Design a protein around this ligand. Sequence first.
Ligand SMILES: NC(=O)c1ccc[n+]([C@@H]2O[C@H](COP(=O)([O-])OP(=O)(O)OC[C@H]3O[C@@H](n4cnc5c(N)ncnc54)[C@H](O)[C@@H]3O)[C@@H](O)[C@H]2O)c1
Ligand SMILES: NC(=O)c1ccc[n+]([C@@H]2O[C@H](COP(=O)([O-])OP(=O)(O)OC[C@H]3O[C@@H](n4cnc5c(N)ncnc54)[C@H](O)[C@@H]3O)[C@@H](O)[C@H]2O)c1
Lengths: 376, 427
Amino acid sequence: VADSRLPNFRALTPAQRRDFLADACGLSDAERALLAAPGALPLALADGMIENVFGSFELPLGVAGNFRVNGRDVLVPMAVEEPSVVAAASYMAKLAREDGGFQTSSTLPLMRAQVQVLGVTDPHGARLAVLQARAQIIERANSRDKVLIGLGGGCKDIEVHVFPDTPRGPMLVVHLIVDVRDAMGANTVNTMAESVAPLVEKITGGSVRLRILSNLADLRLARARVRLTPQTLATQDRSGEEIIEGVLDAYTFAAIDPYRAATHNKGIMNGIDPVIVATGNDWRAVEAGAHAYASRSGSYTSLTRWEKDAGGALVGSIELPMPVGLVGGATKTHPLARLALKIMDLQSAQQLGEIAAAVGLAQNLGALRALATEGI
Amino acid sequence: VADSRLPNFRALTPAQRRDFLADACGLSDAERALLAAPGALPLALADGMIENVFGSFELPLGVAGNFRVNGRDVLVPMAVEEPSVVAAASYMAKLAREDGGFQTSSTLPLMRAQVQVLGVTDPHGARLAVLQARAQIIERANSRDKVLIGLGGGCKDIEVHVFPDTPRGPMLVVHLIVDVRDAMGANTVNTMAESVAPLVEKITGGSVRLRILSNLADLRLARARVRLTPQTLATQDRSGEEIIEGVLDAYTFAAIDPYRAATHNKGIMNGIDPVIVATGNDWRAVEAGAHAYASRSGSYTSLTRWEKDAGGALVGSIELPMPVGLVGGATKTHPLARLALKIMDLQSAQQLGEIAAAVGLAQNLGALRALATEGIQRGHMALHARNIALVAGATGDEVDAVARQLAAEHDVRTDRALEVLAALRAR
Ligand SMILES: NC(=O)c1ccc[n+]([C@@H]2O[C@H](COP(=O)([O-])OP(=O)(O)OC[C@H]3O[C@@H](n4cnc5c(N)ncnc54)[C@H](O)[C@@H]3O)[C@@H](O)[C@H]2O)c1
Ligand SMILES: NC(=O)c1ccc[n+]([C@@H]2O[C@H](COP(=O)([O-])OP(=O)(O)OC[C@H]3O[C@@H](n4cnc5c(N)ncnc54)[C@H](O)[C@@H]3O)[C@@H](O)[C@H]2O)c1
């Protein structure tokens, strides 16, 4: 059975932690050697990934323990530079174990691809024409990516949003709603936006300008929930109930004040970004989606919610875009990203997204607990 | 004296780029050696930075060339994993040199510390008591950090904000406004928040709960602007004037649509975050301050503006929080972070923040210019890139993928196609 409980990792050396992980996760001896020596990313490989490469930049690579998601333990690799982050994630995950861990879910892996049409004098009418022709546009979008279609992904729907008065004239904006399966999906969806452009121009009689995914991936949401009783939260000097009221004080402060919410959401991303980096995923894309979603209400606010259930237990919840992949980009190119994803042992990118959402929620809890405990 | 031009860098091997950087920057043999071998971050040193360390994780480390900020050349190290990001920064920086590079400025390095006060039944009245006690509170905040006060920083002002109707009761929130000089300032500012809490509790009669910085560092703004004439932007297949109009088409899209603005601002952070990472700074803090700032107006929108000047030259401008440091955190623990500061030859944190805003502005320009001028049908450069990918041995879906990277890298040649194809076949 997979077990995310780490035995006294603070008292082991880095080498002993590495051997424990290689043992528990069944890494090959060649994978173990890959972790034992610096330079897992060959310079010639890095050189083919970005430009003007002259070396490599190391981040500390840690692992958060105790995470249990939908009944299944998972080890969480974290590449980050900041103290306390990994420890807080682990400790809050240990508290969450007492109710059975985190409960998560997600939408389908739906990415938006935007197609900007300019010069349409009747954008409202043209919108209706595009929507009428949607089957044809979906067909055209799906003709090239045989691998994605064969997996059951591809363009599933289209939307059209009209901006009839702009300094550049009216804009008609087609959104292709694309299932990208286990990829983050940016390149996947950009190609479809480019492919549908002649057909969109013919239908609208306009000129297509930008063909590009939206990073506000609010149709690819990950959701996570945790519950903690006062018994679980009680310490020697503070009662579980007192800690709980202090956490709600801290949360509401983030809910109503963007100056606090920015900080509150930053602590969430302390949890999430290190998993994104360690698995070879684009962290700028996850950061953009999270913080943009945080202002969907008209005001920048908390991505999490903290409440009490009928019996007084603390309930935290999170919902946010989670565009991530088990394939594509660097996720299978960087040898340690391949290795980190093997440590986590996941079947879908949704699973990775749900685990990320849980890690963020625990990280947020760790901050709120600490900030409300600390004495004057 | 400082030169940021990287001649023939596309054709050089990583080792040669390294040796060039060492000479151009006057690095010591100890510094050049640290670049020569992997493991610049010793495991035992990593072990002291975060918890539960079992190794280290490498990002590709590149350098963007051609950048010139307020008349000074500066090389920009960039740690990132995504193709074409480093290339777009360099190429737009190169076009930027024609008008003289970038012009930048910043505000004072002012950070906010929040002191949340609960249980006050007259929050409005108690706010006026706190504001009256301004000097006493400021002196309290400045009583411990003697090094910072001696440098010219310290708590300079306060603000009080009242939330009279919340499910947790009324909230009175004191902001300490602290000049943190060359540090990121989270610790400095947190400590002051703790320091004034008993005095704030005395004045208001309330209970202080959170004592914490605001990552919404809108008193610590970096600003950068750039100008490019039609002549500078002209290409063989497109006039400068129609590229300028295209960029304007793309910019307004981001200004009005949050679905486009998010991607537009993500591209800005493609330029900024890798500098943040390479200099040992907290990228989560920079991400938080940028994206929260982007919705200050009530709607999530662009962090940059793109316009034309009187004679029709494209003008781009950017303004955003930039909480970064040259001291503290990992910027002096990590040996490469220390070295990256030496390569940039930075005199202050403000200067690091202005450079990054310029890199972010340049990245945005590269993205907008590319997206707006991409042909509806494959043009002759795109077809040439496919042929180059084919001759280098690409097949199936690899052809378009390699050719896409080559074109976006402005490095459409067979030797590059070989390096990029080998990367893809490392999957
Ligand atoms: N603003 C942005 O976020 C943005 C924009 C452009 C590019 N990027 C970069 O795009 C890259 C990610 O693009 P991508 O995610 O499309 O990956 P990719 O282009 O490397 O791979 C996508 C392809 O993988 C194939 N595939 C095989 N197995 C699959 C599976 N199980 N599920 C889904 N697809 C499968 C599919 O044919 C699909 O087309 C990153 O490097 C990112 O930085 C980001
Ligand atoms: N949400 C957040 O952003 C957050 C929250 C908590 C902690 N952190 C972490 O805090 C750390 C950074 O805080 P910090 O910047 O105060 O670093 P720091 O902890 O090293 O403190 C800076 C100290 O160095 C001294 N100093 C010496 N030279 C100085 C100079 N030229 N200018 C200013 N101060 C000088 C000062 O006395 C100052 O107090 C980061 O690691 C960050 O990840 C971030």
